[PDB]
Amino acid sequence: VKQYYFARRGETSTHDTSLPPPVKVLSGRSIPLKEIPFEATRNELVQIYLTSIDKLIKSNKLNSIPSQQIASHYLFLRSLANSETDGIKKNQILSLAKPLGTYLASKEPHVWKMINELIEKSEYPIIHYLKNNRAHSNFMLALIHEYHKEPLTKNQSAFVQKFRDSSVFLFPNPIYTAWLAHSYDEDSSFNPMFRERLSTNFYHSTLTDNLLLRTEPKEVTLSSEHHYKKEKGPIDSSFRYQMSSDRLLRIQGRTLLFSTPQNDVVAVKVQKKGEPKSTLEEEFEMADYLLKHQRRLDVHSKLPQPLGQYSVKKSEILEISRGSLDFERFKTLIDDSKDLEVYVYKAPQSYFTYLHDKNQDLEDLTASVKTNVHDLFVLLREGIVFPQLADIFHTHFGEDEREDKGRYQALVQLLNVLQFQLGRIDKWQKAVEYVNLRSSGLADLGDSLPITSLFTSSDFTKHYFSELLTGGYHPTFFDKSSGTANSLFTGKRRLFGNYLYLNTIAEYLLVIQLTLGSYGDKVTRDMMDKPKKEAVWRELANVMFTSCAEAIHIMTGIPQSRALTLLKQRANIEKHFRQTQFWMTPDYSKLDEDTLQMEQYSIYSGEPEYEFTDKLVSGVGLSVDGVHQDLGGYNRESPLRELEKLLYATVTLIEGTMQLDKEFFKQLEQVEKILSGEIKTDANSCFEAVAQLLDLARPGCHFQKRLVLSYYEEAKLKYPSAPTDAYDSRFQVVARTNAAITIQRFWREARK
Amino acid sequence: DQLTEEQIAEFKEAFSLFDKDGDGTITTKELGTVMRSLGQNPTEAELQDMINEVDADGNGTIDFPEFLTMMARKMKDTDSEEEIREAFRVFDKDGNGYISAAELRHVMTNLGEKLTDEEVDEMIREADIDGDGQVNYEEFVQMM
Numbered sequence: 051v052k053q054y055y056f057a058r059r060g061e062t063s064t065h066d067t068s069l070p071p072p073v074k075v076l077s078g079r080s081i082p083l084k085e086i087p088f089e090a091t092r093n094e095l096v097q098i099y100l101t102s103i104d105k106l107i108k109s110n111k112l113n114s115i116p117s118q119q120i121a122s123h124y125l126f127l128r129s130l131a132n133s134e135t136d137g138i139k140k141n142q143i144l145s146l147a148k149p150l151g152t153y154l155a156s157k158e159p160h161v162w163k164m165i166n167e168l169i170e171k172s173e174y175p176i177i178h179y180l181k182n183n184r185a186h187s188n189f190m191l192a193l194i195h196e197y198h199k200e201p202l203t204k205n206q207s208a209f210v211q212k213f214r215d216s217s218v219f220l221f222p223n224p225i226y227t228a229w230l231a232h233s234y235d236e237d238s239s240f241n242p243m244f245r246e247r248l249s250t251n252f253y254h255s256t257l258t259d260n261l262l263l264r265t266e267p268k269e270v271t272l273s274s275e276h277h278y279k280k281e282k283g284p285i286d287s288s289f290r291y292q293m294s295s296d297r298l299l300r301i302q303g304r305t306l307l308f309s310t311p312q313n314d315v316v317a318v319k320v321q322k323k324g325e326p327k328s329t330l331e332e333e334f335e336m337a338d339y340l341l342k343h344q345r346r347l348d349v350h351s352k353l354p355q356p357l358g359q360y361s362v363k364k365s366e367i368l369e370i371s372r373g374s375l376d377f378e379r380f381k382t383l384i385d386d387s388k389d390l391e392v393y394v395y396k397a398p399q400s401y402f403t404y405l406h407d408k409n410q411d412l413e414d415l416t417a418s419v420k421t422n423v424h425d426l427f428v429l430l431r432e433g434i435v436f437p438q439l440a441d442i443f444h445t446h447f448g449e450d451e452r453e454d455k456g457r458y459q460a461l462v463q464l465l466n467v468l469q470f471q472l473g474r475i476d477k478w479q480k481a482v483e484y485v486n487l488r489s490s491g492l493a494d495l496g497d498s499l500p501i502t503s504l505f506t507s508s509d510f511t512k513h514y515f516s517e518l519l520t521g522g523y524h525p526t527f528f529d530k531s532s533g534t535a536n537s538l539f540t541g542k543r544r545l546f547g548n549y550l551y552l553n554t555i556a557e558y559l560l561v562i563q564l565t566l567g568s569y570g571d572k573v574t575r576d577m578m579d580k581p582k583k584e585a586v587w588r589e590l591a592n593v594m595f596t597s598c599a600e601a602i603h604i605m606t607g608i609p610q611s612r613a614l615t616l617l618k619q620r621a622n623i624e625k626h627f628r629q630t631q632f633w634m635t636p637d638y639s640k641l642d643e644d645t646l647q648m649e650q651y652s653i654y655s656g657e658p659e660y661e662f663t664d665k666l667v668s669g670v671g672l673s674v675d676g677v678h679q680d681l682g683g684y685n686r687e688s689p690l691r692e693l694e695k696l697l698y699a700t701v702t703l704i705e706g707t708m709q710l711d712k713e714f715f716k717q718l719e720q721v722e723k724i725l726s727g728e729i730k731t732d733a734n735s736c737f738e739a740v741a742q743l744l745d746l747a748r749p750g751c752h753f754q755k756r757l758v759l760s761y762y763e764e765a766k767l768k769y770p771s772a773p774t775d776a777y778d779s780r781f782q783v784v785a786r787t788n789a790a791i792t793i794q795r796f797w798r799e800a801r802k
Numbered sequence: 803d804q805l806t807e808e809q810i811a812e813f814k815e816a817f818s819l820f821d822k823d824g825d826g827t828i829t830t831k832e833l834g835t836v837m838r839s840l841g842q843n844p845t846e847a848e849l850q851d852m853i854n855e856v857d858a859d860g861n862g863t864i865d866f867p868e869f870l871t872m873m874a875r876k877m878k879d880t881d882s883e884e885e886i887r888e889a890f891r892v893f894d895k896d897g898n899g900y901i902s903a904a905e906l907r908h909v910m911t912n913l914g915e916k917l918t919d920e921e922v923d924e925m926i927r928e929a930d931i932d933g934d935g936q937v938n939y940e941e942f943v944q945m946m
């Protein structure tokens with residue numbers, strides 16, 4: 051009864067084995083591609099910053115810039131000092147940083163006293179100062195361009211052209227990580243957005259890019275007991291089901307439903323057009339597997355029980371199904387061959403109701419979406435990927451010819467070159483009309499793809515995201531001198547494995563949103579009750595945000611309550627509720643240009659109103675064809691903006707928490723090897739190592755700080771008469787909070 | 803009685819982090835560490851006793867339900883009124899044995915798992931404390 055998953059998360063060197071040839075051909079011309087070392091080039095930029103610091107202090111013109119730039123410079127230098135373990139470099143940087151303190155302490159006492167407050171809190175005191183819109187000023191890059199009176203290197207110049215947004219992008223690994231997990235808590239008034247001469251520049255993608263281009267290349271391994279290695283013997287089925295048309299309920303696609311005495315359903319699946327026996331034996335083995343180990347993974351779904359898989363003569367199937375209304379579509383869906391393979395299973399009725407059926411009340415849907423989101427992600431961790439929930443297609447003009455194969459990517463900013471905004475969905479109302487989410491749980495499992503295959507060059511990965519594994523070519527990137535392609539993109543080749551892990555999660559939650567989005571519109575269509583209209587929409591917005599909170603709780607292991615808070619900072623639920631209400635209904639199709647503009651501004655409070663030049667269709671809205679509605683104009687972004695914002699806040703949370711906690715383990719294994727008696731230095735070095743250990747704790751979490759508290763007490767006991775001036779205040783707070791918790795826990799007794 | 807939902811939520815996060823390979827099974831070689839995180843003051847003797855009792859097979863993988871039960875075996879009795887009194891006296895600056903009402907309110911509101919004002923005002927009023935009086939935390943723990 052041991053609940054343990056058969057996956058194993060580990061680390062390899064590099065994925066770069068059996069890739070596409072790193073060459074692009076254009077009009078017969080073979081251009082190769084080369085990598086910029088991201089780590090190296092940034093480190094070079096850091097060092098150039100430091101020589102620029104030196105140049106300015108030599109200039110004696112510290113009056114030239116506002117006080118806030120100076121303060122930022124001081125706090126960054128002290129943080130860079132503590133983050134480095136190079137002793138000679140540490141002495142160099144502190145010698146550089148001291149004259150700034152000499153100025154600020156003397157001249158402006160107000161701000162200086164604010165900084166000295168922040169210096170005692172945390173020995174990464176940059177992260178606590180850049181937790182608001184003070185970030186949106188790029189102090190490092192401005193200063194470089196100010197004082198770097200040398201021709202720039204090409205690699206660096208290319209780097210800062212991609213990451214021009216912030217100054218935060220030039221911190222070394224530990225500091226950046228801590229900031230990008232600490233900019234989510236209740237303290238943070240951060241918003242990844244800034245205005246500049248009536249041009250809004252978002253970058254809620256660039257943060258995710260810049261975190262992942264640091265992490266070690268993930269690698270999965272399945273254990274021996276796993277399905278996708280266990281060479282299980284063939285399905286021994288002698289059981290046959292004598293079928294009678296008298297008991298037929300209905301027909302759907304290539305499935306026939308028949309009533310049981312137990313109120314359950316016995317279903318017959320016939321093979322598809324060109325689908326061989328391979329899929330049908332796979333689906334059977336899947337279902338047998340996921341009922342054998344339902345106790346292990348504690349998958350909450352009522353999952354279908356298989357019964358038989360064999361061949362039948364076509365004549366009998368054609369004879370029996372003839373009674374129903376939809377016989378023409380069922381006749382065309384089956385193959386022309388007279389020997390047809392079947393697959394039978396037994397399920398509760400709620401298996402054949404599509405999640406987006408309008409006959410359900412709200413609570414039933416709430417606990418049904420919850421069940422389905424949990425069962426998806428619990429399965430994912432195990433090692434099973436579902437690629438084929440819904441056929442969300444971008445377009446059908448370029449389908450085959452283009453790279454992405456018309457397949458919607460949820461993270462289209464990450465996986466391409468110079469693609470920023472999330473793309474227009476097409477004919478969505480139908481695009482999830484046969485979605486796999488059912489009110490009883492997960493369904494249609496035969497299309498499963500081992501997570502291992504998301505990291506290799508399998509049929510799938512080679513098929514769809516070619517231009518990830520190939521390497522980025524763009525007109526401007528072409529250097530005539532080298533004759534090869536330089537980019538910060540190409541280096542994604544070694545680290546594509548991670549980008550396809552987060553694309554899985556982000557596409558899953560987009561299926562969930564479109565489904566809840568379709569349900570809402572379908573039920574609200576026949577309504578006159580505008581307060582009730584918002585009452586339905588608000589309920590489906592909340593269910594969305596509970597859904598992402600169950601995602602993060604299963605992946606990374608934050609409690610859901612805190613995780614919801616850490617989300618509801620970023621994507622302001624009210625905006626997301628309203629955007630949906632508007633952009634999914636045929637109601638706005640009955641408006642004029644002025645009323646539309648007024649509705650647009652009211653709904654996109656701070657951000658600019660949505661620009662489009664399409665002609666609306668009555669009863670439909672925006673349509674390329676003229677019958678089915680879309681989401682967004684022609685060749686423009688999604689009108690569901692705050693949905694993109696929520697999607698990036700989901701990923702950057704999952705990666706930016708696992709990465710941080712890989713950082714904390716590095717520091718603990720450091721500090722313990724100090725304390726034990728292997729690595730021997732003094733009190734100051736010991737205290738610093740404990741001070742860094744506290745600063746790499748999870749956001750707004752308690753126990754982690756409680757652990758470090760224990761180490762500090764052990765450290766202070768070891769060094770008897772060591773000065774305690776610097777590190778009394780921080781641990782004092784941590785001590786007080788440990789006390790407060792104990793008191794509050796004991797109080798939980800006002801019962802009976 | 804059994805453990806509360808808060809304790810489930812704390813023991814989860816901690817054990818889910820310390821799963822260095824995120825599989826769902828922590829190694830016994832490091833069990834002693836994570837126990838300190840959950841507010842235990844362990845000795846090597848009891849650690850070795852838990853190693854033998856659970857891992858007599860020799861696998862060295864500890865799962866969530868086992869971890870909760872073993873922690874419950876530890877949490878049978880470790881703390882008392884004295885442990886609560888010491889946790890109260892870290893606010894008691896002068897060793898008089900009394901605490902202020904306004905400071906107690908502040909810390910109960912500001913830190914940890916934020917309380918509501920209605921619950922903390924109940925904590926003061928039902929403790930029979932004068933509004934302009936000092937709170938005998940020793941007598942308060944004796945009353946609770």
Ligand SMILES: Nc1ncnc2c1ncn2[C@@H]1O[C@H](COP(=O)(O)OP(=O)(O)NP(=O)(O)O)[C@@H](O)[C@H]1O
Nearest residue numbers: 444454457458459462469470471472473474685687
């Ligand atoms: N998954 C996606 N597939 C395609 N385009 C997308 C996708 N996601 C976003 N886009 C948007 O596609 C826009 C560019 O239009 P796109 O159709 O890709 O190229 P084009 O220059 O118009 N020529 P073409 O590709 O031949 O049709 C960008 O503004 C992107 O925001």
